[PDB]
Symmetry: D2
Subunit: 330 residues, 4 copies
Amino acid sequence: KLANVVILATGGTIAGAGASAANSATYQAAKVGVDKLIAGVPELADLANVRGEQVMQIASESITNDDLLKLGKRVAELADSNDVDGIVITHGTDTLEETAYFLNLVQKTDKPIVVVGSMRPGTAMSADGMLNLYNAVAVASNKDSRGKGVLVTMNDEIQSGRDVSKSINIKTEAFKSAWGPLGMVVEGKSYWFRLPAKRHTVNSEFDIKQISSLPQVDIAYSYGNVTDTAYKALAQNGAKALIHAGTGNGSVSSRVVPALQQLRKNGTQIIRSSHVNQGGFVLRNAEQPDDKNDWVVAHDLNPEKARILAMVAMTKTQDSKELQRIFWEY
Amino acid sequence: KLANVVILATGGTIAGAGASAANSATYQAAKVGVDKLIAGVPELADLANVRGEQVMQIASESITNDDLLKLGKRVAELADSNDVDGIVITHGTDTLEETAYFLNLVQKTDKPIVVVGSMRPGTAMSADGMLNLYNAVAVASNKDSRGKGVLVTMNDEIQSGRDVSKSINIKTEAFKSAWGPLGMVVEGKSYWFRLPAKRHTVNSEFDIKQISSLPQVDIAYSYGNVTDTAYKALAQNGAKALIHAGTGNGSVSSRVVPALQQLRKNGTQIIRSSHVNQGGFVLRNAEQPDDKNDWVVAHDLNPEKARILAMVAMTKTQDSKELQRIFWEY
Amino acid sequence: KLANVVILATGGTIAGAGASAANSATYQAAKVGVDKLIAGVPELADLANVRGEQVMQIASESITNDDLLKLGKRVAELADSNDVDGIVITHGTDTLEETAYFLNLVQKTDKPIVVVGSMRPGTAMSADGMLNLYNAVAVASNKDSRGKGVLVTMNDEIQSGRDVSKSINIKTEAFKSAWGPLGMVVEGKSYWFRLPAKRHTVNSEFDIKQISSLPQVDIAYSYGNVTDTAYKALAQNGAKALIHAGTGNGSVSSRVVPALQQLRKNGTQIIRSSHVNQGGFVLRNAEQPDDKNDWVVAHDLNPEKARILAMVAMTKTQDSKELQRIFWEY
Amino acid sequence: KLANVVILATGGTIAGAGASAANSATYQAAKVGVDKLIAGVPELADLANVRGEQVMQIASESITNDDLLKLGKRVAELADSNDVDGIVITHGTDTLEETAYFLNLVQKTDKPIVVVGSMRPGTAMSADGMLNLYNAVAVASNKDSRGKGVLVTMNDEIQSGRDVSKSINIKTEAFKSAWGPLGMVVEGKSYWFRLPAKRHTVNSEFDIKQISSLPQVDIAYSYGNVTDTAYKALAQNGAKALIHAGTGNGSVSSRVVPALQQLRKNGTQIIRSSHVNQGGFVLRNAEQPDDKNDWVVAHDLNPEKARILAMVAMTKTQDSKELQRIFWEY
Ligand SMILES: [N+]
Ligand SMILES: [N+]
Ligand SMILES: [N+]
Ligand SMILES: [N+]
């Protein structure tokens, strides 16, 4: 018998519509409901027994921490049901990478959780969403998908939710990871070539069920002639930790260092990421004396991903050395 | 009888030093003088007559707008001299991509200007700097290099200064461009496979000789649950233009749109870039009604690149349609 | 008024059909005619006045030199007509890269010639062919496309016919170039970022009109424990030149060197390419003494592209030093 | 008290020497002895106790099947010894990817086996070999390296020996894999981001101790207007299996199909690979009816990689369904 898969719809370009078939870049996100999304891929019925549920209808650049929590807690509920074998989430692409990393850290289940979007609205010619959705249900349907962490299925690939990032605009190959795809999905079949090495889902020390609301964490960008202005304003407005999106290896301008020392003395966690996001990672004590200043290094995680990990980490700890540990395992 | 090449030293990792040969990532930048960089590559003498000049000695994450104007001016002086065939600038890698684009925009010469750094200090084993310096002089020595715009020579490649970006940390292949290298340099010899399509150097409408002050331009990051806080703070502290580093196709959160509209009415330019920096570009009037709000789209340029262009363009105009034209040509 | 564009159909996956919408990889190529291809993109009518012509209906792995010549000569005829502004060729993907380089070398016109395929048959869900075709007619329609060489429009990119290669199986981003795309096509609009630097079309020394039939040229693969067997068999069966697909930098096994010396003494041109095809290029006199042995080096061209250039070159010359020149300009 | 690491020297560019420091691409391989390679990196002594042993001194394009069996046997001997914690093999880059996959298949140990070369001779300026050697010993020294399969450490990366391929000529980043690096090595320290999903070393059904002869396996290239000539010649000269390096998804020309059917009836295995080697894989029964012809598909493996697997698999089986299973697991 077919697996039981629930599609949780959250909006996005995959649910969007444009004026004509020629409109693949200019359209409205989050205009179509989950039942109409489902009826557009009749071939779904042959993969799984599927049901749809509209959680929200948003354009994903306008997502809030509360939306995240509400999504997280609805996933946890479905994962708890015997009636559910896998979960597919349809999501806008802009912050898909943030939602997928969140769910990877806090859902303690090894049922397949698959996040899926599209780079063209369903009304464009050569719209990518139908096969992307098919593939998502195909991977969520598969017993081989269990225990692999949160997965995203776009462009015929199986990408890890941890480190897949929207790296290329316009094109359907928008999502890349520095460490490669985990496998591919072709004609309903999954093919695996690599496994995750970082902690996730069922071996996570975090749990969406214990989390009532997330700490405020914000990101400041760095570049030539940058001042401490945005750093202090964000901290003043209540940020519990600041992600520093540095040049190069999380480097900090000499004019900004003292602001960060004092912000740290005042209890704000300082996490050194970078805007050098195709590969490599930020080294502890290389650019700055992190031990001396009690700063944390975000390893390979880009700024918007380092924010998600910091938020979740800080529901359990505000020890800087523990936060570094967490940035080195997850 | 060889070409005459001036090396302008500004500091950086090429001039950096570490504790041992094993220290390829933990070291101090800007430790060695230009005369020592040159003496360390005696083979330079077969490529050209080289003289060195120490302009500054900085780690490139700490560069200021004055540093830029002082470098640009010294480059213009040297380019005017007849005893100068080519110019090589040694630079730290962190903001190398910012200086390179700046000089591409404001040096109205077609003499070769070559910016070069290194990903390893010269004390580390397998240091990349000696060969990078050698290739920089080889490219600047070459008449084929003239009229190509500013060039950067690392990793055996000839990259365009316009859109080469530090994309990968730690590794020697740090610098990539979405549109590919222009050619390669192998054993003193240059090989070309593409030409620039964008306006630069001699056909730029900008001239460093007519620029003695640059306007303040700052960058704000966008992500899930971002607020208008950093945008407002940056504007209050003097930003004449804001580079919005948006998710996706320069998308703007629903709760940041109102503050952006207001900052534009108060006269600060709103330039929509993105943190999706491996390929593609941000399309005018797709995510936001730019025409209606009088905002500008940064095309394919990443946030720090779009800062450099906005800063140079606004020495000459504050019309937003002029600004959009410039972002579509350079 | 609209430009006049002719679509020459040659078969391929873009004209293919599968059993169901789920069949994106298992289908029949070259099953649909050009008039039905045209009727499936009604939006074409708004770009150009288009007419279709079925030149052949093949799967492109089974193309012959005669097919190439017949295609080449029909293009030349259309390019000569006042009634024709641009030409689009629909082609299977397997040898698309070979046809596109051929046309780049021998069509002396600067009217837009656009080659286009698809990685999924038109019957698959999320089939890429409709937008690919649209984009092809959009680029062929555009006066800015003139004088750029032969172009291929897939995956929203504008790729050079010279060095675009099918590099990735299954995925719609199959086609890559070592030197980057030239630009992109979005919603009918073209955006350019680079220009060609190698000789082509209107500045080619070759001309399809003088060519009655092509020399036989064949390719032998190299690897550990390879013998001279395939090299001698191909030469014996009448190959006028052999493309050596070497390991690394066109390297030749010591057991195979004498076979190649003698084959050269016997009049067979020896052209050193490689199966190291993501980037870089083969250097003359690095791996082997090419001057000594009178061999030719294929520069950056992969084996199937080096074959196309050798065939066309040899309709004008059998001088090895001239052949090297040609491999360094085209 | 440090780990005990044996360096097995086989020659190659790491041991190569050129005329001057500027000679990074024009030089002789296999000139320097293992004792000199080691003496040249005194820092190795902080990582482990190293002893060197010169196994051969070859340029890697000239390697034979005996060379492979002799290396594999010597590796098995050393792996059995208790005085040996890790094994480093210095190798030329040309067929490095072939030896690495061979050892991955037949060494039934989980001690670290690390293969390393260099893209520049050790006499050239900015030679990559010293740091590559250092990192190889650092990775082999590390208990975290055990059970990972054969590893290759170049360009600061830890690449899987299974699917790492020499993909880019000249440049230091020559070796890539479609599925990404497993991790990185920075300043002696290893960082992991992915694990192998494929069978290897200790869970291989193959054992070098039970292999004293390898069957003859050869590769034919496919392209436009290819004939059955090289296929037939290779089979006549002793090939027990043919790797067909097809266009696209291992596609076979219409005029080569009949000769392949006949060669299979005569008992030579037909393995469909491709020269589309950046990503994707060749799908059974898509391009050709493999079931009906009793052919095998090489999955994601490139032609020279599929040669190594077919050669090892056929020491144990000649059933084609067994052969397909093996190509789907290793
Ligand atoms: N969006
Ligand atoms: N730095
Ligand atoms: N095909
Ligand atoms: N070699």
